[PDB]
Amino acid sequence: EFDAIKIALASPDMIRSWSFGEVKKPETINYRTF
Amino acid sequence: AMHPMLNIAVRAARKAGNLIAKNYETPDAVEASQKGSNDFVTNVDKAAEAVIIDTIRKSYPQHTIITEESGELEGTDQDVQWVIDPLDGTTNFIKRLPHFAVSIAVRIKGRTEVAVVYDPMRNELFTATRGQGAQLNGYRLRGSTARDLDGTILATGFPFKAKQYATTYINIVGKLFNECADFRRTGSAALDLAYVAAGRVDGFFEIGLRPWDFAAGELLVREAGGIVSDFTGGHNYMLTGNIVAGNPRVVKAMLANMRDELSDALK
Amino acid sequence: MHPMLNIAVRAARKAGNLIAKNYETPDANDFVTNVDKAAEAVIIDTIRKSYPQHTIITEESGELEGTDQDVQWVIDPLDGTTNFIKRLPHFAVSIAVRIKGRTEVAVVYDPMRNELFTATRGQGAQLNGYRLRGSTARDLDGTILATGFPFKAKQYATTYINIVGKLFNECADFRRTGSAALDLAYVAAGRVDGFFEIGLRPWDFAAGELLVREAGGIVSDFTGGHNYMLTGNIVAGNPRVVKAMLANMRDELSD
Ligand SMILES: [Mg+2]
Ligand SMILES: [Mg+2]
């Protein structure tokens, strides 16, 4: 496939493009049901 | 669950799409009523607009609404705006070509918050809400996987209302056609953007777009993993009507390709 | 002239059912060649049920000849494969029943929108029960042109571009779908006024030219003759837009 590794900063647009949503709440797991 | 404003908007869009589809089978009643340089506004557009506005007023008698026809109907709570195109590609409808969609987007504090577009003919409903993503009748939308210009399909609209830049545009077109695979020209910027969100086109660009047309698609492609920009990477697009969008790498390639051919009028 | 069209639409419906039923599976050009071959297989095998002697012309293996050389059957189970590759729901099966070198019957069928345009000499061009009319234009103002780009023959592009340029200064707007047969079907139902293309091939537009002609329109090659049957530089529509377009496009001839 490839032959090189590009690297640079990422615009907020790029970062948001990588995303699959916007996490809001710190809580991880329900304990009464895992 | 679901986002509330999104829900009320999709109800509005369903009603509007059903009205448009119901009128689509009687071309003897909908006439051609032109407004500017080949931007028809038929009575069916007015009826769909009124239906949407009525359906909204039930749940937000205070939200300021924007519409290409009625300008800007102020509301007692003008921090949130409702941008509408009851019909996109009026020409495609008057020719009874079955490819058009209604677009409803809701901005909060200026930043677009939710958007929906609805094609009644194929019965496709592109929904999108920031922080949750974009859906096509229940499927996630991650745009095209393209990472170059080869084999890439480019959807576009032509400045057939700002024909002064025609040459310029055509110029760049030629340049593009030297690297891309094939073009697409459907006639409804909202649906083209939607297709970008669905990866059905590897990218998109256009000149001379009204601020009330991409507002329902720019968030769509954004939460669809793609990105938008002006013809130079800035953000004056919201005023220039010059959009270029697609998955990030393709957008980068397109911008680096177009920056030279660009007439400095759009810059 | 009924039973020929009968077999035609039968094979068309079965092929469209197959194509759609397959299209409901996910993916992200192996698959398209697979389904193209499978559709051609079902088509031809349903054909041999009646007249397994007419000479079939596909788009892949030349001309599958037969023992009754009075009738040729032009077949394309998929046109603008790019669409089905990239999930864009716009593609149609194109069947053409030609005789003695000319065509008598034609059927284009879009499975997704479930559209089906039939056409035959004299008895007209129907959309599931509609005496089609073509468009109503008489000029190049407020008109639409279903265009086409050489995604295999880009050499013309430059002068092609020129055409586009001049065309844009004359017409109102453009379209581009990739399915030349669908462009033809759209000019038949007047969904778009004029159609043109640089270097097409008979297997695709064979049915579409019969459509647009039967709908009260006419076809032509770029230089007004009839070598389109071998050159595929098509310009088609109702005579009004055809004149209004040829008058401005011939002066940039390169083929
Ligand atoms: Mg509009
Ligand atoms: Mg084919």
Domains of chain B: which residue ranges? 1-141, 142-267
Give the three-class secondary structure for C166: helix
Distance, in Å, from the CA atom of B135 to the CA atom of B124, rounded to the nearest integer, reads 10
Nearest CA distance, B165 vs chain A (angstrom)? 28
Distance, in Å, from the CA atom of C195 to the CA atom of C220, rounded to the nearest integer, reads 10
- Tell whether B117 lies on the interface with C, counting CB pairs under 8 A: no
Distance, in Å, from the CA atom of C135 to the CA atom of C190, rounded to the nearest integer, reads 4
Distance, in Å, from the CA atom of B245 to the CA atom of B247, rounded to the nearest integer, reads 7
Q: State the distance from the centre of ligand 1 to the C-alpha of B189, rounded, in angstroms.
A: 10
- Tell whether B201 lies on the interface with C, counting CB pairs under 8 A: yes
> Considering Cα of C92, then C93, then C97, then C100, what sign does the dihedral take?
positive
Q: How many CA atoms lie within 13 A of C102 on its CB side?
A: 5
Find the angle CA(B178)-CA(B182)-CA(B184) to the nearest 5 degrees: 125
Question: DSSP letter at C139?
Answer: S
- Residue of chain B whose alpha carbon sits nearest to that of C177: B184
Q: Which long-range contacts (CB under 8 A, 24 or more apart) does A20-26 make?
A: A20/B133, A21/B131, A21/B132, A21/B133, A22/B130, A22/B131, A22/B132, A24/B131
Q: What is the DSSP string of B185-224?
A: B-S-HHHHHHHHHTTSSS-EEEES--TTTGGGTHHHHHTT
Find the angle CA(C114)-CA(C112)-CA(B6) to the nearest 5 degrees: 120
Q: How far is CA B209 from the centre of its chain?
A: 9
Q: How many CA atoms lie within 13 A of B249 on its CB side?
A: 12
Distance, in Å, from the CA atom of B149 to the CA atom of C45, rounded to the nearest integer, reads 40
- Write out chain B residues lying below 8 Å of C151, CB-based: 181-182
Q: Which amino acid is at C8?
A: A
Distance, in Å, from the CA atom of B41 to the CA atom of B35, rounded to the nearest integer, reads 6
Decide: C196 and C234 in contact? Cβ < 8 Å. yes
Element (H, E) at B24: none
Please count the other Cβ atoms lying within 10 Å of the Cβ belonging to residue B108: 13
- Cβ neighbours for C27, distance < 8 A, ≥ 6 positions apart: none
Q: How many CA atoms lie within 13 A of B153 on its CB side?
A: 25
Q: State the distance from the centre of ligand 2 to the C-alpha of C111, rounded, in angstroms.
A: 15
User: Which residues keep their CB under 5 angstroms from ion ligand 1?
Assistant: B 85
- Confirm whether residue B150 is marked as ligand binding: no
- Cβ <8 Å between A17 and B227: yes
Decide: B101 and B118 in contact? Cβ < 8 Å. yes
- Residue of chain C whose alpha carbon sits nearest to that of B121: C113
Number of inter-chain CB pairs under 8 A, B vs C: 86
Q: State the distance from the centre of ligand 2 to the C-alpha of C12, rounded, in angstroms.
A: 14
Decide: B105 and B4 in contact? Cβ < 8 Å. no
Residues in chain A: 34
Give the three-class secondary structure for C233: coil
Distance, in Å, from the CA atom of C188 to the CA atom of C168, rounded to the nearest integer, reads 22
Report which of C195, C68, C87 is spatially closest to residue C143, judged by C-alpha positions. Answer: C195
Decide: C98 and C1 in contact? Cβ < 8 Å. no
* Helical ranges in C24-156 per DSSP H: 30-47, 81-85
Alpha-carbon torsion angle C226, C231, C235, C238, nearest 10: 40
Residue found under tokens 């001309």: C63
Nearest to C144 among B91, B178, B201 (CB): B91
Give the three-class secondary structure for C49: coil
Nearest CA distance, A28 vs chain B (angstrom)? 17
Give the three-class secondary structure for C58: coil
Q: How many CA atoms lie within 13 A of C184 on its CB side?
A: 37
- Cβ neighbours for C133, distance < 8 A, ≥ 6 positions apart: C189, C190, C215, C216
Residue found under tokens 């299209």: C23
Question: DSSP letter at C25?
Answer: S
HEC secondary structure over B49-117: HHHHHHHHHHHCCCEEEEECCCEEECCCEEEEEEEEEEEECHHHHHCCCCCCEEEEEEEECCEEEEEEE
Please count the other Cβ atoms lying within 10 Å of the Cβ belonging to residue C69: 11
- Cβ neighbours for C146, distance < 8 A, ≥ 6 positions apart: C174, C175, C176, C177, C183, C186, C187, C192, C194, C195, C196
Q: How far is CA C176 from the centre of its chain?
A: 14
Whether chains A and B touch (3+ CB pairs under 8 A) is answered by yes
* Helical ranges in chain C per DSSP H: 2-23, 30-47, 81-85, 157-170, 180-188, 202-214, 228-231, 239-249
Mutation for testing the B interface, residue in A3, A13, A22, A23 having most B CBs under 10 Å: A13
- Cβ <8 Å between A21 and B222: no
Q: Which amino acid is at B194?
A: A
Strands C102-110 and B242-246 come out as unpaired
Q: What is the resolution of this structure in A?
A: 3.8
- Confirm whether residue B210 is marked as ligand binding: no
- Cβ <8 Å between B131 and A21: yes
Residue found under tokens 């579409």: C208
